[PDB]
Design a protein around this ligand. Structure first.
Ligand SMILES: CC[C@H](NC)C(=O)N[C@@H]1C(=O)N2[C@@H](CC[C@@H]1CCNCc1ccccc1)CC[C@H]2C(=O)NC(c1ccccc1)c1ccccc1
Ligand SMILES: [Zn+2]
Length: 103
């Protein structure tokens, strides 16, 4: 088990980073902090403390756990938290993501 950011290990620590999170963003800090994410200070850019995965451009209805599974399926935190079945389900829902983001 190897973490990327030991300082952002706890929920309380990640919550602290959302102090200056833009009020206009339609995703709530607690939902993002719970999915292992913390605010990186630029735009609406969040990173996972474990896999170092970065996400941005948060739209309304976006589920942080689904997005975590969608883009960073091998994250060991996402797996002990949500399980292989969930990760495999989301992966099945979006089976050509590389070719989705590659134009
Ligand atoms: C997260 C929710 C958002 N919207 C669902 C989304 O999926 N957003 C996506 C997203 O973020 N990412 C994926 C694809 C981009 C889209 C944005 C387009 N949404 C339009 C849309 C409209 C309608 C339907 C679907 C989608 C790739 C991984 C991540 C990302 O770009 N990370 C960057 C980053 C780095 C550092 C820190 C933070 C973030 C980064 C960028 C380039 C290289 C490396 C890392
Ligand atoms: Zn992760």
């Amino acid at each position: 088990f190897s973490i990327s950011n030991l300082s952002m290990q706890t929920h309380a620590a990640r919550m602290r980073t959302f102090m200056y999170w833009p009020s206009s963003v339609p995703v709530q800090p607690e939902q993002l902090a719970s999915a292992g994410f913390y605010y990186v200070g630029r735009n609406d850019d969040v990173k996972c403390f474990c896999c170092d995965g970065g996400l941005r451009c948060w739209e309304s209805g976006d589920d942080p756990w689904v997005e975590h599974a969608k883009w960073f399926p091998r994250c060991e935190f996402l797996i002990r938290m949500k399980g292989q079945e969930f990760v495999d389900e989301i992966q099945g829902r979006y089976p050509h993501l590389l070719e989705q983001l590659l134009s």
